[PDB]
Write a protein that holds these residues in place. Structure first.
Motif, PDB file in Angstrom:
ATOM      1  N   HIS B  45      35.043  18.818  -9.002  1.00 31.12           N
ATOM      2  CA  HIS B  45      35.912  19.935  -9.334  1.00 31.12           C
ATOM      3  C   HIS B  45      35.639  21.166  -8.520  1.00 31.12           C
ATOM      4  O   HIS B  45      34.539  21.339  -7.977  1.00 31.12           O
ATOM      5  CB  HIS B  45      35.671  20.382 -10.820  1.00 31.12           C
ATOM      6  CG  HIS B  45      35.375  19.289 -11.818  1.00 31.12           C
ATOM      7  ND1 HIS B  45      34.163  19.201 -12.489  1.00 31.12           N
ATOM      8  CD2 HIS B  45      36.144  18.227 -12.204  1.00 31.12           C
ATOM      9  CE1 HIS B  45      34.220  18.145 -13.278  1.00 31.12           C
ATOM     10  NE2 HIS B  45      35.401  17.508 -13.114  1.00 31.12           N
ATOM     11  N   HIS B  47      34.911  25.022  -8.849  1.00 29.98           N
ATOM     12  CA  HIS B  47      34.422  25.986  -9.849  1.00 29.98           C
ATOM     13  C   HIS B  47      34.750  27.410  -9.439  1.00 29.98           C
ATOM     14  O   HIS B  47      34.957  27.693  -8.251  1.00 29.98           O
ATOM     15  CB  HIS B  47      32.917  25.837 -10.079  1.00 29.98           C
ATOM     16  CG  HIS B  47      32.596  24.677 -10.951  1.00 29.98           C
ATOM     17  ND1 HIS B  47      31.846  24.810 -12.123  1.00 29.98           N
ATOM     18  CD2 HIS B  47      32.942  23.375 -10.832  1.00 29.98           C
ATOM     19  CE1 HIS B  47      31.748  23.608 -12.693  1.00 29.98           C
ATOM     20  NE2 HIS B  47      32.401  22.749 -11.931  1.00 29.98           N
ATOM     21  N   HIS B  70      35.215  25.879 -14.412  1.00 35.69           N
ATOM     22  CA  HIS B  70      36.235  25.375 -13.514  1.00 35.69           C
ATOM     23  C   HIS B  70      37.199  26.460 -13.093  1.00 35.69           C
ATOM     24  O   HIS B  70      37.527  27.316 -13.904  1.00 35.69           O
ATOM     25  CB  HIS B  70      37.040  24.225 -14.135  1.00 35.69           C
ATOM     26  CG  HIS B  70      36.261  22.972 -14.353  1.00 35.69           C
ATOM     27  ND1 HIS B  70      36.860  21.834 -14.837  1.00 35.69           N
ATOM     28  CD2 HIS B  70      34.947  22.685 -14.121  1.00 35.69           C
ATOM     29  CE1 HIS B  70      35.926  20.905 -14.888  1.00 35.69           C
ATOM     30  NE2 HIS B  70      34.762  21.385 -14.482  1.00 35.69           N
ATOM     31  N   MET B 123      32.097  21.157  -6.627  1.00 32.22           N
ATOM     32  CA  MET B 123      30.977  20.610  -7.382  1.00 32.22           C
ATOM     33  C   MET B 123      31.132  19.120  -7.646  1.00 32.22           C
ATOM     34  O   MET B 123      32.205  18.661  -7.963  1.00 32.22           O
ATOM     35  CB  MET B 123      30.928  21.350  -8.735  1.00 32.22           C
ATOM     36  CG  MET B 123      29.636  21.253  -9.517  1.00 32.22           C
ATOM     37  SD  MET B 123      28.298  22.234  -8.816  1.00 32.22           S
ATOM     38  CE  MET B 123      28.815  23.914  -9.227  1.00 32.22           C
ATOM     39  N   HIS B 125      29.380  16.200 -10.100  1.00 36.89           N
ATOM     40  CA  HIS B 125      28.607  16.013 -11.350  1.00 36.89           C
ATOM     41  C   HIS B 125      27.945  14.645 -11.464  1.00 36.89           C
ATOM     42  O   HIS B 125      28.287  13.697 -10.740  1.00 36.89           O
ATOM     43  CB  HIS B 125      29.513  16.207 -12.572  1.00 36.89           C
ATOM     44  CG  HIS B 125      30.095  17.586 -12.672  1.00 36.89           C
ATOM     45  ND1 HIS B 125      29.567  18.560 -13.538  1.00 36.89           N
ATOM     46  CD2 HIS B 125      31.138  18.166 -11.998  1.00 36.89           C
ATOM     47  CE1 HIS B 125      30.296  19.668 -13.383  1.00 36.89           C
ATOM     48  NE2 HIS B 125      31.226  19.472 -12.455  1.00 36.89           N
TER      49      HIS B 125
HETATM   50 CU    CU Z   1      32.855  20.712 -12.598  1.00 36.81          CU
END
Ligand code: CU
Ligand code: CU
Ligand code: ZN
Ligand code: ZN
Lengths: 151, 151
Positions: B45, B47, B70, B123, B125
């Motif tokens: 995503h 951020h 986000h 990012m 995760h």
């Molecule tokens: Cu994220």
């Protein structure tokens, strides 16, 4: 309404799941729920003919061969990305299959409309897809392993 | 011109590759060339903050925490799909990492423009992303493992 397509393993002939097709403002979303596939990225495309049957060449059987080549209504005659116009409109993003043989990650094909999909086949290949005819024709997908006919 | 972003592993601090960002008529294409990541699908995503630094909560360190939440310029306050509007515009398709720890499959974010990306962080995760806040908030991505600041 969305569309559901049943997918079948071309080697054993057994079902491996379904794919849900949905029209969205950004294109068509393919949400798979498949199992029993080899882990890794697989070439995933829409083919011309509405058939998952095999065909023959030089007396050899070609599984899924009846589906013909990639859906290419603009006659581009080239394999490419799902977001480039100079190539087969049937070129979808590669389908991911987890370590346990499950495919559940959705992908978007922004150039397609749900309407035009009817009557064609959805195909999953043994190999991957680098979205190019280099170094291997049609993205290196190779053999056809699972197939389904839309609507 | 496209943009190249260098990605860094948050635990060891070492580089793991780059991501190429490209503006296309259908959105922004993210073409990764990463290595050394755990196999499987990872939440991916954009951020809010342009930082990969950590932050603290209750005296605990949160790796990548400075990037904030986000990217959500329309204040939707919800996590969702890359092709739905009522959720974080920073919601990208999940990033695939092969058995050998390589990430090379490109993905498209149709709602984004390259222009607006500057100054935010990309990012990756530990967990995956089911594109929903159910059953786990923010798609179940969990900890932040690799991060990079755009432009
Ligand atoms: Cu994220
Ligand atoms: Cu194909
Ligand atoms: Zn093609
Ligand atoms: Zn989100």
């Amino acid at each position: 309404q969305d569309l559901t397509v049943k997918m079948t393993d071309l080697q054993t002939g057994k079902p491996v799941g379904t794919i849900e097709l949905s029209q969205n403002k950004y294109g068509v979303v393919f949400t798979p729920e498949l199992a029993d596939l080899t882990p890794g990225m697989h070439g995933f495309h829409i083919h011309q003919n509405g058939s998952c049957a095999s065909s023959e060449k030089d007396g050899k059987v070609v599984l899924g061969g009846a589906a013909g080549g990639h859906y290419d209504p603009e006659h581009t005659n080239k394999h490419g990305f799902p977001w480039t116009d100079d190539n087969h409109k049937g070129d979808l993003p590669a389908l991911f299959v987890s370590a346990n043989g499950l495919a559940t990650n959705p992908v978007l094909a922004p150039r397609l409309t749900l309407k035009e999909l009817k009557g064609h086949a959805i195909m999953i290949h043994a190999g991957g897809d680098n979205h190019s005819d280099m170094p291997k024709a049609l993205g290196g997908g190779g053999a056809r392993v699972a197939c389904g006919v839309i609507q």
